[PDB]
Design a protein around this ligand. Sequence first.
Ligand code: KVA
Ligand code: ZN
Length: 197
Amino acid sequence: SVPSQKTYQGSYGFRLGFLHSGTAKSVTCTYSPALNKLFCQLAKTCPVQLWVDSTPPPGTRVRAMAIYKQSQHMTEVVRRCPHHERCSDSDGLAPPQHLIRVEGNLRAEYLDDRNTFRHSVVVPCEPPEVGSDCTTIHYNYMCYSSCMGGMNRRPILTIITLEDSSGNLLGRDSFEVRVCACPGRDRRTEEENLRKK
Ligand SMILES: O=C(O)c1cc(I)c(-n2cc(F)c(F)c2)c(I)c1O
Ligand SMILES: [Zn+2]
């Protein structure tokens, strides 16, 4: 089984947005539009904006899930490596095996799928604060892309789904993720490789 990654705005015009954080050596999270790829440091805040054209019903939720990007690995569950799943860095809510956490939301729920064994984290949709035009979720990625015995240098993508109260699909978007020590340099490197190619 493999979750769909097809971009789908749906009835509410759902799509993601990312800040413009630049590529300085010191940056902890930065998004490349040209690569549709987020680069971030281990366990650091990753702001992801949610945008809609119209308001979804009460009880709508937003779920995040990681899959391997390469087809020959896509059936493998993305999980934390043998070291990080045992490092007792729990926040009291996320299971220690889950790669993706939501930061600072006590309503986050973590799912181990009973049939696929895949991990996901889902939060209730809330309207923007007064004066804002979108809602931001803060994610953390809890292993490096390079972690031996886990991602092991394989690229992943995060799939963000808008769901109704039963879990039915209302919208979908996605982005590649690299968790690395120097997101600014790696974004510059990969963007240059893309330009030369
Ligand atoms: O303008 C509004 O009234 C409005 C209401 C909602 I509920 C959301 N919303 C929150 C999410 F997590 C999500 F996926 C969509 C947004 I973004 C809005 O702009
Ligand atoms: Zn790890």
